[PDB]
Each structure stands twice: as structure tokens, then as C-alpha cells.
């Protein structure tokens, strides 16, 4: 699907004749399932049918359930997206720490390089140069924590020295919101690939279901920070709408200009193929 449908209104959803059925007192609308990419439920007054849920699982459409605050609560994860998943589990168990640390190191290098590109586009030569120096200084096992230092210098230089990632401000709220949406799309792509989402490529000790999808969503984080930086003066609602405009906007992949969902799908495909083939080629995404 190419469409992201967001329902903030009370209504009933049903499935008839391969068409999503939106039924409300004021109006009724039918949207085909093949066009819909992502289904987002932003309120708690929405009603759906388990048959529609089943058809969304067969259609492989990501379903996201939000809270009364409209922040996302829980998303649907299909058990079997494709038969190739059961065959892929053996490969994931057979993966090597050299391949995991190599691919993760290259991905972190791409993220820091994209931050240096964002500061270069923002015309900060000292900060872009320092982040570039940490990029050239990144090493395996990350003994120097130049990724965390790159993040601290990044947000401190963008939003000011008094700013911090641990603050409760709507800036960090919107950052965690965009990281949750991008984490949901990347997690859904990892479900499409079939490999375990809980196994990360950087640290064996940390156990989280979103670790892998986080490692894959690292390079695309500066995309959120741009709109957060531009709309930081606007209210959190308008910031959220501008964050929803990211799905409509297009970005330039190395091959051509493609949509965000296609870049994430192809990027994750090349990452999985590179992990199973032990680093044949590493996909690089630049702003």
C-alpha cells in the first residue's frame, strides 16, 4: 500500500469485499486495502472487527493503536509474515559478531555522517567538523562512545546548551514520537524480513524487542530533527502534523528519489541480505 490512513474520530470499521469500510453516523467511506500502507488509530473510541484485523494481517498492513493522549500505545505484530522467516531464524542464529559489529559500525557511521551533513546544510562548520571528526574516529566495540557524544553535541548545538535529551519538553516529546513512528515502520519491515526483532547487532547484553529496528532506524533520525528544529516554536499539535507530512514528502535515495516507506523497505532488504551474505554491500542513505 501507498496510503497511510489516520483515524482520530469515533467510528466503526468493518471488512467487506476487500474494502476497508468506515461507518459513522455522519458519513460512510470505503477505501481499498491494496492502496492502504499504514493504519493509525489515534483515539480510543474507534471500533474494529477481528475479521478486519485478520485481513490486515494477510494484507501485511501495520496497525498502530494510540492512547487517549494520542501517543501510540501498541502495534499489531503478525506471527508469520512469510514462509522465509522460519528459514531466516537459523541464519540469524548463525550470524557472526564480526558481521554484526561491522554492519552496526557502518550504520552508526552513516548516522553520524548524516548529522554532519545536517549541520553542514545548517552551515555549522565547527560543529559539523567536530561531528565529522567523531565519524572518522568511530571504531569497533565503540570504546570512545563517539555516537553518544555526537548525539549530545548534536542536540546541544541545535537546541542550545541548556537543552538535554532527558527533559520533559515538547521537543523531546516530539523526538520520542517520531522515533516511535519510525521505529514502528522499521519494526514492521523487520517483521516482513522475518528475522527476530529482539536480537540487536550492537550489544548482546541489552535485551529489547525494538533493538534491531532501532539500529536500522539510526541513520534516518536526523530527518526528524530537521522538522523538529523548524517547527520547535510551533505547538505540539502542529509539530505532530508536520511529522505526519514526512510520509507525504519524498527523499533522494542514492539510486533515485523514492518515498520514505520504499527507502526503508529497500534499505532493510539490503541490510538483511548483507547480513546473510556477510557484508557484500552496505546501503548508504544521505540527506
Amino acid at each position: 500500500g501507498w496510503r497511510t490512513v489516520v483515524v482520530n474520530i469515533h467510528s466503526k470499521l468493518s471488512y467487506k469485499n476487500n474494502h476497508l469500510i468506515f461507518r459513522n453516523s455522519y458519513k460512510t467511506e470505503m477505501i481499498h486495502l491494496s492502496e492502504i500502507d499504514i493504519l493509525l488509530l489515534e483515539t480510543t473510541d474507534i471500533v474494529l472487527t477481528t475479521m478486519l484485523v485478520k485481513r490486515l494481517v494477510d494484507e501485511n498492513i501495520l496497525v498502530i493503536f494510540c492512547d487517549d493522549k494520542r501517543l501510540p500505545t501498541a502495534f499489531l505484530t503478525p506471527y508469520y509474515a512469510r514462509h522465509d522467516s522460519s528459514l531466516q531464524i537459523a541464519r540469524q542464529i548463525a550470524w557472526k559478531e564480526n558481521v554484526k559489529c561491522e554492519v552496526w559500525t557502518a550504520i552508526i557511521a552513516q548516522k553520524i555522517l548524516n548529522q554532519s551533513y545536517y549541520l553542514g546544510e545548517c552551515s555549522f562548520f565547527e560543529k559539523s567538523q567536530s561531528i565529522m571528526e567523531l565519524y572518522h574516529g568511530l571504531e569497533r566495540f565503540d570504546p570512545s562512545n563517539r555516537e553518544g557524544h555526537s548525539a549530545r553535541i548534536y542536540f546541544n548545538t541545535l537546541f542550545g546548551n541548556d537543552f538535554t535529551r532527558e527533559s520533559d519538553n515538547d521537543i523531546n516529546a516530539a523526538l520520542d514520537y517520531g522515533y516511535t513512528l519510525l521505529l514502528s515502520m522499521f519494526a514492521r519491515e523487520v517483521v516482513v524480513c522475518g528475522c527476530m526483532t529482539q536480537i540487536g547487532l550492537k550489544h548482546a547484553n541489552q535485551f529489547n524487542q525494538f533493538n534491531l529496528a532501532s539500529d536500522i532506524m539510526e541513520p534516518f533520525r536526523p530527518i526528524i530533527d530537521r522538522i523538529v528544529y523548524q517547527n520547535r516554536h510551533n505547538n505540539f499539535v502542529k509539530i505532530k502534523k508536520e511529522l505526519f507530512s514526512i510520509f507525504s514528502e519524498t527523499y533522494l535515495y542514492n539510486g533515485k528519489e523514492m518515498y520514505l516507506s520504499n527507502i526503508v523497505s529497500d534499505y532493510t532488504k539490503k541490510v538483511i541480505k548483507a547480513l546473510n551474505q556477510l557484508g557484500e554491500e552496505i546501503p548508504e542513505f544521505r540527506i
Binding site: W2, R3, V5, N8, F247, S248
Partner: peptide, 11 residues
């Protein structure tokens, strides 16, 4: 042909 479909308040 719209990428983002809003059913609800249009913000």
C-alpha cells in the same frame, strides 16, 4: 492520489 488520508479532524 493522496499519500496521507485523514478520517477525523483535519488539524
Amino acid at each position: 492520489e493522496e499519500r496521507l488520508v485523514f478520517l477525523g479532524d483535519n488539524y
